[PDB]
């Protein structure tokens, strides 16, 4: 179940939950655990042998936050769309890596032997190189941004020398080709070696890819607030990397073309004996030819210039004016570069930081460039700015830099100073609403910062822009201010109104839902009053605004509880009321407020669990006490509609054995609950192996013996429990030693199957009957000789107390051993068990039958005795 | 011996009472020397700076530790230190047999690599021991540059591991084949060494980060946290992860050779408990970004921009916030976002960006290192940080009128004092540490219940801060309330009187003594009194305590330290005179049973020595003790304080008739020293030349058994007998022979010593010479006391020992070179033959028969 449930966890990883940020670590871990439990539902005993029952219970969470951090390592919507390179290469990588996934077992099989030829040693060495690659690959993806780039900053050169592999075995492959020529001519070991050479080629190509995307991510990191200058260096490095890539690929693929030629030559010239292994080989030859044709699918335009190309000295409205943010004296770190058609070329050359008390109006000959490539300049002052000063389609005259200046003025936090900045800019009145950082940054940002009063009263011309203006992420200004609590400006916007139920472009959500977790009771009332918005709104994932409001736990939920016409209860995608979250989010005040508003609508989830069982699952001791203090909703003693389980069963089954003690100490608990298999919760505890609650229930007078419909008894469970103390524990409790199966399978037979000799000897001093026998008539001796457990059958022969007699079938236990044919045990049995094997059966024919049955070895002739 | 005093040093190191200035570095170094003397308290001994060097370096190591409530990662530091000690115990234990491995040399060719890893061990040990010797500044300075070398080493250990796995392959080969035991033991040594080195590196980096916390660079704090995380992850992958670390290989080798049907040495069993330790260690080892982007408070009311110097006008802002208060304190850097902010201090701090179940503490900064702290609470907070910050800032200022202005303004602006800062209650106790005008007490007067009982991080009350600050006026201003003058702090519970004595603000302690109503008689940690702290203070302030209260002037401590001895150590003659005038001399013999003159000799303070001489009152210059009746003169004898020794010699009542244990007198001590000039001065004074001992030894008995002859020349100038018998009748010739100094016997015989002396046993000088078997001694005997051929009751002739001791040339001198001419030397002359035949003898013994 470890691998299969790990794959289920990887499926949950591919879900990518955190974009809909409603996943608390608890509310993502505990549901995953219960999902695993439900998918592995059903009860037995073989699981309870520590085979597949509870092997993982917590460390799966490790992979869970793995999934989360690999998810969030993705670029936070990098303003440049240059990530299409990484996207393409990852798409190519997925298929090749799956093919390598099958080739993994293929070439674990390919390990059939070593040194059929001397080249096979080199094959093994390059195999070890591959396994080095695979070992290094796993650790890479885990770490978050800072640690990720830290690990990046050293292994890149190692990988570069790995592609230019320290031992360029290609000529060794060519020599292997020359040898396998004759090797295939003679008839194959070289037949087995073609798989190896092809696998090496695949690993080669995969390593080239891996280098490529790691470089691409490094470039991305240096792009978004990274090393600005080193972005250009890294891009040139990856360009040269691609050049050497292509050239060495042409050479290696000339070799591979020779390989294909000789493969066809062998196919035609060979006799008609081959391997279907080579048939899958030829299918992958087709695949590799496709990937070979794939190779053809793939700043100078930007930076042969400086800023002083065409200086604009001065004129009206742009005279040198001392303005705070536009400081007079600090550098002018100009930088113009390319982006268009998704393609992006970014340079970093602030070659002219020349400072004057003048104006930045000069033009840089943008209008004359013949190439139809869109350009963009960004002019830092003293350090790496957000890098989006001015986007010019065909011309820049500082006007878009002026737009950025207005944008920055909108980022001020001083109110009257912001008004003064607004006056200064409206002297010229640059184009508001211009998009920066791929965001409709002007109006959204001014709404975020505030002073929406002045912005509205000066620029109230387009309410549609005020409402349905969406950014790179597809964000309305309402969503912009949702988590930012511009309550007064919420009145400002609602005065002319806005889309109450606007949905963002990706992971469609109300701005209300965005504001739900902000805990802004002073802001939410505005939407709560004016339009009477749909309180029962469900996003792309069916979580109520109430659900998304349980996060804050503040008085916002209390205001929302009852004042409007609310869906006081609902059902989530997996069947989760806000009461479920309140139980799990551990906000006791909100739980009490909800109890005040309405009674507990203890509706079960999709897999038939009420919020009661979660507390037993995670030992929610404080809420456990509070819910007992409710004194009502006695569903703590109810059952799962799925399979009739109380929360006590889950508490015992998760080893969280404190809330169980609490519940036991609460009141007169009903332990007579029966579930799938008629297994008492006592039997479940016996399987788990917790003596404390065991004797605790014993004090509460729990019924020791209620035979289950599964055929087992708690005595058998103890006989198979690896903790031999529990059987004795039940012994002083007075548990009947004859707590046997309906099939009369005593736990002696169980232990004979198990091999737990200590519990065997236990039952020996306890004097369990040895002359007894189960339904087929077989004493536990027969089961043991079927299983052939050495020390167990030794103790048996010590205390067999049986005459080695015929069962329902005429076999003696020695005949059972004969059928087993355990030659060492057969010889052990022949004499130490007194032989007397003359006329044992009718004329002693049983042995004679075993002669005349078939061709029998002379070993049996010796065993005749 | 030396290790015993090292253990005593360690015990002294453990307790923080000596870091408490109630005992000072000199004041603790001196008792170490005297305790070394006491534990040291003959004959063979006749034939200390390093101790105090060890003490001072260990106290420096204690000083290297950081302050209380300083930084984070402290649980990691503590646990890693604990397991580091645990590992180092076993490593030190196993080092001995690791060395013993290096004797079965070259049964294997990889023994060169074994020597290589041994040299690796030597390098590591030298570096790590060289680390633990420097003060904090030198400590961090040394760690700085070589942190890179240490990090390099962290991987440069790789060929050790690779060659070690290869060696373990060959070792499984060897053990399953049968000398591999030593190599497997070296395997274990490599494993333990790797683990220990890694833990050492982690602990060192942790402490370095902790130091960087104290106004260093938070960016550097993130860098160091990243480094420690990466190193621990390297550990995990290398030795615990899915990749099979060497521990898996060693466990499988143990299991495989466990099935070996062979009988093997106890080395395997010891390695088995070693592997038990390894798997226990294996089980042990196998287990925020947000910003006030927009929300500046608008003028709801009372923002009222004031030109506050504290909240500087025109500067920018910086900020970050991290989680603390339970276990770890994950740390983060977000100063990319801070930018210019002016107008009035009104940032709506907005904790609620991710209002999770964590206590996130924002620390606020600007251009340089800043106060960098603002409040703590889960839910919404509304910029009371500004007001509280300026509040403790006013409490911290030194311009009292400005403090008045700020206190008047900000309280009206709206906040509460009770909220802490820097985890301190600085807005309330910086008041005591800087003094306060009336309005501080006026504002605090409303409750009369906040500041008085206000425990700090260390639990101090304003009593303690005021007492150390010595702000006597503000001391009265507060004690108008009259709180617990006995407010003992949480750690190192003491009285504010102790603090005042330590500081030296006499006005404050006079004010305390004006209306104490206190138990001034407090006895602190080591049985001391506040009078002892005053003695440390070395000022006339002690007079106020001396006169008015009723303290025990004759106060003795746990170690036997009187205030007299403390003054002697400190050497303030004015204070000593004041103490003498106060009450009686506490010249009582202490726990070690010493006298103040003993310390006067110990430090060699001739100033205080002469002052005590001029006292003449109870100045028991010839006082002896219960333990061996040591005199201060005796201590001056041992410590070779020759100047003070002769100085006191220039006085009258210098008792030359001192009898110690076994009658080892002052002249005997002078002999045992070797300072000849002092002995000559003593003889000029005229002590008993032939002062004897319990074993009937004159001073020349021991002077002879020395390594220089000129001392015997001085004694014979004095006129000591050259044939003075002993209890064993060991004449000076006998003593001179029993050591092996030929020149001593030479000068004895120049004066006419009796060569023919022979003890009751019959041990003639020839017998002693052959007993020492020295060729020079025996040839001198043959020169003078040639051959008496004596024996015991069992007739052991000199030739009998001469042939037992197996020396060739001397036997030839007896029989061939200068023949003894004695054939048939014994009864029928076959006692020699009797010894030839008695039992098993030597292959080469045939010539020794002669």
Author numbering:
A (entry chain B): 50 to 236, 245 to 355, 362 to 928
B (entry chain A): 50 to 90, 93 to 98, 106 to 236, 246 to 354, 366 to 928
Source paper text:
Latrotoxins (LaTXs) are presynaptic pore-forming neurotoxins found in the venom of Latrodectus spiders. LaTXs bind to specific receptors on the surface of neuronal cells, inducing the release of neurotransmitters either by directly stimulating exocytosis or by forming Ca2+-conductive tetrameric pores in the membrane. The structures reveal that LaTXs are organized in four domains. A C-terminal domain of ankyrin-like repeats shields a central membrane insertion domain of six parallel α-helices.
As expected, mature δ-LIT was toxic for our insect cell cultures and therefore, we expressed, purified, and subjected to cryoEM analysis the precursor uncleaved inactive toxin. Interestingly, such particle populations of oligomers were not observed in negative-stain EM, indicating that the interactions are rather weak and dilution of the sample which is necessary for negative-stain EM, as well as the low pH of the stain might induce dissociation of the oligomers. We were finally able to obtain a map of the δ-LIT dimer at 4.6 Å average resolution from 81,192 particles, with no symmetry imposed. Based on the structure of α-LCT monomer, we were able to build a molecular model of the δ-LIT dimer, including residues 50–928 for both protomers. As expected, the structure of the protomer of δ-LIT is very similar to that of α-LCT (sequence identity 39%), showing the characteristic G-shaped architecture and domain organization. δ-LIT displays however a shorter repetitive C-terminal AR-domain, containing only 15 ARs instead of 22 in α-LCT. The δ-LIT dimer is formed with the two protomers rotated 90 degrees relative to each other and the plug domain of protomer A plugging from the side into a cleft formed by ARs 1-6 of protomer B. The plug-domain has a hemispherical architecture matching the cleft formed by the 1st–6th ARs of the AR-domain, suggesting an induced fit and shape complementarity as the basis for the interaction. Besides the main interaction between the plug-domain of protomer A and ARs 1–6 of protomer B, there is a less pronounced interaction between the helical bundle domains of both protomers, involving H9 of protomer A and H6/H7a of protomer B. Whereas H9 is interrupted in protomer A and in the structure of α-LCT by a short loop in its middle, in protomer B (thus most probably upon dimer formation), this loop folds helically to straighten and complete H9. In comparison to the compact conformation of the truncated α-LCT monomer, full-length precursor δ-LIT (both in the monomer and dimer state) shows a different, rather extended conformation and a larger distance between the helical bundle- and the AR-domain.
